[PDB]
Design an enzyme around this catalytic site. Structure first.
Site, PDB file in Angstrom:
ATOM      1  N   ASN A  83      28.257  52.684  82.590  1.00 61.60           N
ATOM      2  CA  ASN A  83      26.818  52.517  82.779  1.00 61.60           C
ATOM      3  C   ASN A  83      26.417  52.752  84.234  1.00 61.60           C
ATOM      4  O   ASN A  83      27.234  52.611  85.149  1.00 61.60           O
ATOM      5  CB  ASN A  83      26.379  51.116  82.336  1.00 61.60           C
ATOM      6  CG  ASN A  83      26.703  50.835  80.874  1.00 61.60           C
ATOM      7  OD1 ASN A  83      26.359  51.618  79.985  1.00 61.60           O
ATOM      8  ND2 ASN A  83      27.362  49.710  80.620  1.00 61.60           N
ATOM      9  N   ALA A  84      25.149  53.100  84.438  1.00 58.46           N
ATOM     10  CA  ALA A  84      24.623  53.378  85.768  1.00 58.46           C
ATOM     11  C   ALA A  84      24.759  52.226  86.759  1.00 58.46           C
ATOM     12  O   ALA A  84      24.818  52.451  87.967  1.00 58.46           O
ATOM     13  CB  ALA A  84      23.163  53.796  85.662  1.00 58.46           C
ATOM     14  N   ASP A  85      24.806  50.993  86.265  1.00 58.36           N
ATOM     15  CA  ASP A  85      24.917  49.850  87.161  1.00 58.36           C
ATOM     16  C   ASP A  85      26.351  49.450  87.474  1.00 58.36           C
ATOM     17  O   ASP A  85      26.594  48.397  88.060  1.00 58.36           O
ATOM     18  CB  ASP A  85      24.150  48.649  86.597  1.00 58.36           C
ATOM     19  CG  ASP A  85      24.675  48.193  85.251  1.00 58.36           C
ATOM     20  OD1 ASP A  85      25.519  48.901  84.656  1.00 58.36           O
ATOM     21  OD2 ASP A  85      24.231  47.123  84.784  1.00 58.36           O
ATOM     22  N   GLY A  86      27.303  50.290  87.088  1.00 60.30           N
ATOM     23  CA  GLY A  86      28.693  49.988  87.378  1.00 60.30           C
ATOM     24  C   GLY A  86      29.475  49.268  86.292  1.00 60.30           C
ATOM     25  O   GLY A  86      30.696  49.132  86.400  1.00 60.30           O
ATOM     26  N   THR A  87      28.792  48.791  85.257  1.00 55.16           N
ATOM     27  CA  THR A  87      29.488  48.113  84.175  1.00 55.16           C
ATOM     28  C   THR A  87      29.976  49.170  83.187  1.00 55.16           C
ATOM     29  O   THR A  87      29.635  50.352  83.309  1.00 55.16           O
ATOM     30  CB  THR A  87      28.577  47.100  83.447  1.00 55.16           C
ATOM     31  OG1 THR A  87      27.515  47.790  82.782  1.00 55.16           O
ATOM     32  CG2 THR A  87      27.991  46.110  84.440  1.00 55.16           C
TER      33      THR A  87
END
Ligand SMILES: OC[C@H]1O[C@@H](O[C@H]2[C@H](O)[C@@H](O)[C@H](O[C@H]3[C@H](O)[C@@H](O)[C@H](O[C@H]4[C@H](O)[C@@H](O)[C@H](O[C@H]5[C@H](O)[C@@H](O)[C@H](O)O[C@@H]5CO)O[C@@H]4CO)O[C@@H]3CO)O[C@@H]2CO)[C@H](O)[C@@H](O)[C@@H]1O
Ligand SMILES: OC[C@H]1O[C@@H](O[C@H]2[C@H](O)[C@@H](O)[C@H](O[C@H]3[C@H](O)[C@@H](O)[C@H](O[C@H]4[C@H](O)[C@@H](O)[C@H](O)O[C@@H]4CO)O[C@@H]3CO)O[C@@H]2CO)[C@H](O)[C@@H](O)[C@@H]1O
Ligand code: CA
Length: 629
Positions: free
Chosen positions: A452-456
């Protein structure tokens, strides 16, 4: 000297190692035994967070070996073996040779059927049903000079939370206990914890014995233990690397290599059908090795009398791909340093290695994921295999081996734990069978990893199956199993599974040159390090969807049977899970958990499972070594 390692990931391993061994974090008991998890409110396989498992011990060995690789100090690895032998391998007092030496290889045990529902137990012993002959016992007693077995019992009540104590004294710690006893539908929530050493002091009139097995006369005082084959094989796997890494530095872990080799010698008991029935012809007693499927089965167990002399040993007819370890088989059958002392040890392991790889290939779905396994005992009573059911050497295909609540092969974890061993083998030998399995499996899993874009990120969590593999013809080989399909039901962020997955992909990439696998492995390790680190290792918030069973799961107790747990909890028909474990109400997280259930919400937890933390640490070390630049 050992080759250079990537400084970034070595540091990450070293940091995790410090957090895991940090006394303030509480991963270990005062006796030096690692807990299943720091948190006590824990039910999933074991039913209490501070019990330990042979699984945990084997991960502790792997962790210390890796530490030895980077620090040059292997005293910690030797210590993990010392703790194992002192606390998880029953000593002379726990499995008296007086009883074990009365074992009869021509009549290993007495047959008893398995049932698909806990309410059908106790199971009646039937001396008229055939039982095959045990061909390896003579090899072991001759090599080691004793009738006792050298294998790890799978679970231990480290701080004597249940109260059984040691050998019925109710006060010593740690305490040998067991839980599962009543078939495929007996989940971790439907058991009645019992002591391994049963002197009738706790429980009912005859301890806990007649809840599970029914004999003609009065139950005798007795002991019994159960091995978890995949844990003992992992111990061999870990010890091999410790040996390799120690030698590159002029160090030695000779003593530990000896323990691991002996353990691997006894581990061969998992190669046999539960009651030594011929493989592929379950109605006939075996005459020795014709009763060996040569796979690492769900278990091997043994027991004997406490006040009278007799004993028994059983293998297991159920085989799950998740338990296989081709690497351990390669080690024990080819490395001179790990050659078992028994006459047929090394050769039996050679046969197991080939059989195991055939097993994996037979079970490989059209997509690439590995299907369940097979059994030599349909319905656990050697019944006739339904017509149309695919077979592997006469054994019928089972989608979810041994357990159905929940299905043993619906958890993605089995995929990476098992394939990681195939990856190590491929890395070391370049074996063609292993390459073929990994090329297809890796392409499947690489397409199921979501960043995911947020690092998750997310990876498969729960999976389902459709169809069955084509019947195995050793001369034909893999048909592609066009009618066997895997389906990803949901995704999640299980840090232990993600770590094991990174490990698998790293070994595979290092050998095959597959860039996709290498970058996914690194991204996984980075994402976990950057977004999930905490002061105790790594963690994330997860839902505990089954926790409602703490309060609403009824535990079956036979009509008329009444007894007491050491703390006074009454055992009788009608009790719920919490009723025979009332101490759980004093757990710090209890009120929080119950409040959530009362509000109709799913409880959540932030858990630090020992094996998961070690898995992450080890994965960092593996990457550091295989990709130094
Ligand atoms: O005592 C008098 C009489 O005994 C005869 O021997 C009997 C013995 O009395 C029975 O207790 C024994 O029963 C075994 C069951 O057949 C077998 O199904 C069961 O298997 C369990 C095992 O107990 C348990 O530890 C194991 O747990 C695993 C978990 O499921 C996994 O998730 C985890 O990873 O790993 C653990 C460990 O593997 O699950 C299995 C499967 O459910 O074990 C029972 C013993 O504990 O059977 C004996 C033979 O029938 C004897 O023959 C007579 O001579 C004697 O007079
Ligand atoms: O312990 C001895 C025994 O262990 C077996 O391995 C166990 C692990 O010990 C145990 O930690 C692991 O627990 C899983 C659990 O099965 C999953 O259901 C769960 O995933 C959940 C998640 O918690 C939810 O938030 C989400 O919504 O759903 C998923 C899917 O249900 O994750 C935990 C942690 O990984 O289970 C293993 C398998 O039983 C070994 O197999 C055996 O050899 C050892 O002897
Ligand atoms: Ca059930």
């Amino acid at each position: 000297a050992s080759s250079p390692a990537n400084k970034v990931y070595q540091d990450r391993f070293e940091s995790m190692y410090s957090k895991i061994k940090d006394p303030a974090n509480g991963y270990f008991s005062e006796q030096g035994i690692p807990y299943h998890s720091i948190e006590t409110l824990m039910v999933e396989a074991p039913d209490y967070g501070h019990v330990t498992t042979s699984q945990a011990m084997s991960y502790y060995m792997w962790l210390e070996a890796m530490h030895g690789r980077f620090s040059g100090d292997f005293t910690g690895f030797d210590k993990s073996w010392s703790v194992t032998e002192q606390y998880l391998i029953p000593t002379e007092k726990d499995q008296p040779n007086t009883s074990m030496s009365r074992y009869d290889a021509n009549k290993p045990a007495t047959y008893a059927p398995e049932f698909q529902d806990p309410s059908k137990y106790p199971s009646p012993l039937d001396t008229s049903q055939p039982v095959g002959r045990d061909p390896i016992n003579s090899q072991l007693t001759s090599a080691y000079g004793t009738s006792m077995l050298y294998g790890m019992h799978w679970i231990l009540d480290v701080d004597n939370w249940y109260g059984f104590g040691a050998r019925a004294d109710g006060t010593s710690k740690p305490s040998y206990i067991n839980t599962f006893q009543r078939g495929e539908q007996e989940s971790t929530w439907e058991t009645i914890p019992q002591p391994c050493w049963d002197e009738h002091k706790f429980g009912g009139q005859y301890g806990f014995l007649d809840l599970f097995t029914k004999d003609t006369g009065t139950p005798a005082k007795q002991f019994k233990y159960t091995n978890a084959p995949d844990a003992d094989a992992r111990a061999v796997q870990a010890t091999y690397w410790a040996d390799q890494w120690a030698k590159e530095q002029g160090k030695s872990v000779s003593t530990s290599v000896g323990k691991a080799t002996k353990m691997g010698d006894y581990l061969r008991y998992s190669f046999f059908d539960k009651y030594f029935r011929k493989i592929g012809q379950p109605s006939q007693a075996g005459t020795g090795y014709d009763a060996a499927h040569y796979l690492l089965s769900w278990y091997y167990a043994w027991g004997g009398g406490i006040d009278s002399t007799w004993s028994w040993i059983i293998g297991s007819s159920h085989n799950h791909f998740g338990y296989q370890n081709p690497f351990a088989a390669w080690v024990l059958s080819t490395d001179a340093n790990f050659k078992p002392k028994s006459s047929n040890g090394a050769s039996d392991w050679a046969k197991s290695l080939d059989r195991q790889l055939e097993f994996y290939q037979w079970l490989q779905s059209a997509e690439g994921a590995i299907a369940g396994g097979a059994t030599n005992s349909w319905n656990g009573r050697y019944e006739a295999v339904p017509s149309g059911t695919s077979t592997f050497y006469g054994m019928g295909y089972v989608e979810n081996p041994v357990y159905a609540d929940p299905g043993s092969n619906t958890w993605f974890g089995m995929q990476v734990w098992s394939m990681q061993r195939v990856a190590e083998l491929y890395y070391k030998t370049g074996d063609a069978r292993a390459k073929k399995l990994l090329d297809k499996w890796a392409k499947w899993i690489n397409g199921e990893i979501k960043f995911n874009a947020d690092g998750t990120f997310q990876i498969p969590s729960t999976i389902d199956w459709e169809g069955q593999p084509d019947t195995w013809n050793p001369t034909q080989g893999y048909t592609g199993n066009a009618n066997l399909h895997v389906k990803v039901v949901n995704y999640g962020t299980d840090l232990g599974c993600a770590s094991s997955l990174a490990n698998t992909l790293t070994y595979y990439a290092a050998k095959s040159g597959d860039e996709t696998s290498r970058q996914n492995a690194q991204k996984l390790l980075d994402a976990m390090w950057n977004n999930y680190s905490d002061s105790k290792g790594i963690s994330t918030v997860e839902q505990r969807g089954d926790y409602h069973r703490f309060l609403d799961q009824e535990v079956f107790v036979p009509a008329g049977w009444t007894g007491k747990m050491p703390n006074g909890d009454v055992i009788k028909s009608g009790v719920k899970f919490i009723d025979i474990r009332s101490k759980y109400k004093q757990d710090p997280e209890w009120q929080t958990m119950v409040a959530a259930l009362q509000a109709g919400q799913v409880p959540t937890q932030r858990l630090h499972r020992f094996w998961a933390q070690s898995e992450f640490a080890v994965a960092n070390g593996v990457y550091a070594i295989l990709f130094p630049d």
